[PDB]
Design a protein around this ligand. Structure first.
Ligand code: NA
Ligand SMILES: [Sm+3]
Length: 147
């Protein structure tokens, strides 16, 4: 029919490489100035962990299950004003988003087959955190990568 609305309940997955401690920063198609980790709405009839896994498979082609990896519940939920210029993707009146964090450590840096984004960079955590426009994404990387 149309582009049905994004649900204001979403997940964030902080991917980083264990060996280098570099962070995967993907570049958004709708705001090419916005660099971020993996995000996505938590669909109707699935949990946040299942959403995290589903988002990582879609956005960056990595099967957590197939590659036997550990999807850590980073155990933070924050709430923020959605960026003015992206609000339109949400049902009328919706201005705030609820976001739960997950961190995922890959054994090495790799080539990424991104499907929805323009590009990826592997950055050092401080550089990553300064880059993103998302204050939560920024905090997630500070708390759980820079440590
Ligand atoms: Na997404
Ligand atoms: Sm997605």
């Amino acid at each position: 029919k149309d582009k049905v609305y994004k649900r204001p309940v979403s997940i964030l997955v902080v991917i980083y490489a264990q060996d280098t401690k570099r962070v995967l920063m993907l570049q958004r198609r709708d705001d090419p100035d916005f660099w971020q980790s993996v995000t996505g709405s938590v669909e109707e009839g699935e949990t946040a962990p299942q959403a995290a896994m589903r988002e990582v498979k879609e956005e960056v082609t990595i099967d957590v299950v197939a590659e036997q990896l550990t999807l850590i519940d980073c155990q933070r939920t924050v709430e923020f004003e959605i960026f003015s210029h992206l609000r339109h993707r949400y049902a009328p009146g919706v201005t705030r988003n609820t976001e739960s964090w997950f961190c995922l450590a890959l054994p090495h840096e790799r080539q990424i087959v991104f499907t929805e984004h323009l590009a990826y960079k592997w950055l050092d955590a401080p550089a990553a955190a300064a880059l993103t426009k998302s204050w939560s994404n920024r905090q997630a990387i500070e708390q759980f990568v820079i440590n």
